[PDB]
From Swiss-Prot:
<comment type="function">
    <text>Component of the PEX13-PEX14 docking complex, a translocon channel that specifically mediates the import of peroxisomal cargo proteins bound to PEX5 or PEX21 receptors. The PEX13-PEX14 docking complex forms a large import pore which can be opened to a diameter of about 9 nm. Mechanistically, PEX5 (or PEX21) receptor along with cargo proteins associates with the PEX14 subunit of the PEX13-PEX14 docking complex in the cytosol, leading to the insertion of the receptor into the organelle membrane with the concomitant translocation of the cargo into the peroxisome matrix.</text>
</comment>
<feature type="domain" description="SH3">
    <location>
        <begin position="1"/>
        <end position="61"/>
    </location>
</feature>
<comment type="similarity">
    <text>Belongs to the peroxin-13 family.</text>
</comment>
<protein>
    <recommendedName>
        <fullName>Peroxisomal membrane protein PEX13</fullName>
    </recommendedName>
</protein>
<comment type="subunit">
    <text>Interacts (via SH3 domain) with PEX14 (via SH3-binding motif); forming the PEX13-PEX14 docking complex.</text>
</comment>
Length: 61
């Protein structure tokens, strides 16, 4: 899946995941709708945190 680059934080206090520099996360979505180019994906951390996360903040296995 993916890894955590920098300490991430809920972009919005409604739906997002949290990351602590070095953490890890599983990415599913891409651009999300169409699937073009940009850094913004959806993730699942330890199956406990489900939300989004800029691609420039996570590592691709």
């Amino acid at each position: 899946f993916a890894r955590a680059l920098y300490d991430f934080v809920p972009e919005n206090p409604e739906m997002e995941v949290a990351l602590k520099k070095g953490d890890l996360m599983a990415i599913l979505s891409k651009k999300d709708p169409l699937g073009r180019d940009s850094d913004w994906w959806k993730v699942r951390t330890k199956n406990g945190n489900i939300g989004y996360i800029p691609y420039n903040y996570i590592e691709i296995i």
